[model samples]
Target: AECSVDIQGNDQMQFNTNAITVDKSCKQFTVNLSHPGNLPKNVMGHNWVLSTAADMQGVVTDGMASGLDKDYLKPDDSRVIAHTKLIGSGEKDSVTFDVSKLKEGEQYMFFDTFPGHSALEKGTLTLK
Candidate 1:
């Protein structure tokens, strides 16, 4: 694991951390998503979507529109730097991306795009 972090999301649209950092020297990074709440996916599902800060709004909008069947993400979305699948209570998932895709000095925003979740379920990352 070049860089690894663990984050937890609950039914109240909350994340355990507000931010994460990615080292530019790492070749890859991993995000482990765990859900400890008891809510179902339809009621309070969450997924981690990553993109540049500039693209966060658009990506989130599109992801929600894409629907859960599409993992709340657009197909072949180039703007998506990385993402994990939707997860419900007691479930866990992970996503790994090459650090090469992250540009130095660039900012990354990781958010839960579930409907109404973005308001509180978001975080930021910086490559340095």
Candidate 2:
């Protein structure tokens, strides 16, 4: 469905895909994150976070400080457009946001903010 997508995180600290398209016609969009790895969250946890490309680095930096207990996200960070709870092996999480939050010609970034995980688990999101 244009309104939803399935994404995966693994023990390798990798995301299964690198891009996602959101149709403008949809009122809302959903990101489904699943961790199929065997490691526990503290060892190899993952999460999905969406924010403007400009705000990504700051969010990640703050998230790292937030620690795993907060799902590696700052408490009520307004810059975060949408995000999922941290997940470990065999666990799954999802986040839904208003599609109207997106603007034309603006770039958005999505990534896993588990400490150093952002370096390897990030991607672009675009509106169609």
Candidate 3:
């Protein structure tokens, strides 16, 4: 259905893809995040977080104080549209959301929101 994408993070602390596009015909979208390296979650955890590009920093900033217990993201934060749980090597998680939440031409941001992970794990999302 062209409504889902699979992304991976490795011991290098990086996401394999840097951009994603959602087809307008999709009623919902899903993201699958996996860690293929041997690092543990505490050493190099990964998660997939989605929000408006403009709110990226805000969401990440607050999430920093959330600690690993909360998946490094603020709980019940409205700025976040969707997110997957923190994962380690050999672990995987996915998030699904209604496609109607996104707007055409509106730039969205997705990243591994585990403290400083965003520096190398960030990516852009757009609707087609």
Q: What does candidate 1's lDDT look like per residue over 1-128, in tens digits?
A: 24989989998889999899987778889999999889988788988988999999998888889888887887888999899999999999999889888886678899998887989999898887
Model 1: lDDT equals: 0.88
Model 1: runs farther than 4 Å from truth? Answer: none
Off by over 4 Å in 2: none
How many clashes in candidate 3? 0
Q: What lDDT does each candidate get? A: 0.88, 0.93, 0.91
Clashing pairs for model 1 are none
What is the total number of backbone clashes in candidate 1? Answer: 0
lDDT by residue (tens digit), candidate 2, 69-128: 898999989999999889999999889999999989579999999999999899999988
Model 3 lDDT per residue over 16-54, tens place: 999999999999999998999888998899998999999
Over 4 Å off in model 3, which ranges?
A: none
Clash number by candidate, in order: 0, 0, 0
